[PDB]
Amino acid sequence: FEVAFLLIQWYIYGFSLSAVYTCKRDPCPHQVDCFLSRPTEKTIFIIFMLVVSLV
């Protein structure tokens, strides 16, 4: 379970969050730009959770 959850967590989005996200969706015209809430703190907590899972 640990290994599978870690693999899915890596596959979906990796191990970091970017401040700027490029979104291409049907309602949005052409290629729109969006921004995350607090990417750096979320990335830091991602790193702690990944380390805890590894340990």
29 binds its own copies (CB under 8 A): yes
Closer CB to its own copies, 29 or 51, in the complex: 29
Measured from the CB of residue 22, what is the shortest distance to its own copies in angstroms?
A: 7
Length of the chain: 55
| Residues 10-16: contacts with CB under 8 Å, at least 24 apart | 15/43, 15/46, 15/47, 15/50, 16/43, 16/46
> Is 8 or 32 the residue whose CB approaches its own copies more closely?
32
Binding site for its own copies (CB under 8 A): 22, 29-33
